Amino acid sequence: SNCVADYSVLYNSASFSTFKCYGVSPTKLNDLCFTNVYADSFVIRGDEVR
Amino acid sequence: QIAPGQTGKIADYNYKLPDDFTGCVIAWNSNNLDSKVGGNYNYLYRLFR
Amino acid sequence: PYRVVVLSFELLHAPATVCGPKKSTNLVKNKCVNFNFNGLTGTGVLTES
Amino acid sequence: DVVNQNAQALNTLVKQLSSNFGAISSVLNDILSRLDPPEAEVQIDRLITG
């Protein structure tokens, strides 16, 4: 909460293999404003990413 | 990222596809020809724009 | 191993505090302008309520 | 009765703008923001048909 989500920073040191967005188009993420943002993180095997 | 309606450094600053595209995108791994033991620095990409 | 982060949110129904890198402009009233209030786009005339 | 029926018909025509018609939202602004053209066209077409 209370921060600008400028994801251009991740371009230098991140390489994501699977990026899927549901309910929103990935090209519209630069114009929107999100409420009640939560980040869930965990580690699984390669076959259960799907 | 080579697909209509995608984000990322490639689709934003390097190569963008139109939303109405007729055609096929074909890709295959080339690690046996485009990789060197010390590294291959001949391939470039645009990171800032 | 693969690290997975899932990001959840709602859109255009409740007050938001994150927003994007878009830069805001001045408020022009009593005129027909395109507006972008917290991601909600549209056209109309803005008046005091 | 004539004026009542005509007024009711116009009022219900106005009120039927709140129907999703199978789309994710009933407002074109909310469809056009957070959806890019290629997948917002489907929702817009549903609303147009309704």
From Swiss-Prot, chain A:
Top-level taxon of origin: Viruses
Gene: S
Protein name: Spike protein S1
Substitution effect: residue 47 to N: In strain: Omicron/BA.2, Omicron/BA.2.12.1, Omicron/BA.2.75, Omicron/BA.4, Omicron/BA.5, Omicron/BQ.1.1, Omicron/XBB.1.5, Omicron/EG.5.1; complete loss of interaction with host integrins
Reported effect, residue 10 to I: In strain: Omicron/XBB.1.5, Omicron/EG.5.1
Role this protein plays: Attaches the virion to the cell membrane by interacting with host receptor, initiating the infection. The major receptor is host ACE2. When S2/S2' has been cleaved, binding to the receptor triggers direct fusion at the cell membrane. When S2/S2' has not been cleaved, binding to the receptor results in internalization of the virus by endocytosis using host TFRC and GRM2 and leading to fusion of the virion membrane with the host endosomal membrane. Alternatively, may use NRP1/NRP2 and integrin as entry receptors.
Region (Integrin-binding motif): 45-47
Full-protein residues shown: 359 to 408 of 1273
Quaternary assembly: Binds to host ACE2. RBD also interacts with the N-linked glycan on 'Asn-90' of ACE2. Cleavage of S generates a polybasic C-terminal sequence on S1 that binds to host Neuropilin-1 (NRP1) and Neuropilin-2 (NRP2) receptors. Interacts with host integrin alpha-5/beta-1 (ITGA5:ITGB1) and with ACE2 in complex with integrin alpha-5/beta-1 (ITGA5:ITGB1). May interact via cytoplasmic c-terminus with M protein. May interact (via N-terminus) with host bilirubin and biliverdin, thereby preventing antibody binding to the SARS-CoV-2 spike NTD via an allosteric mechanism.
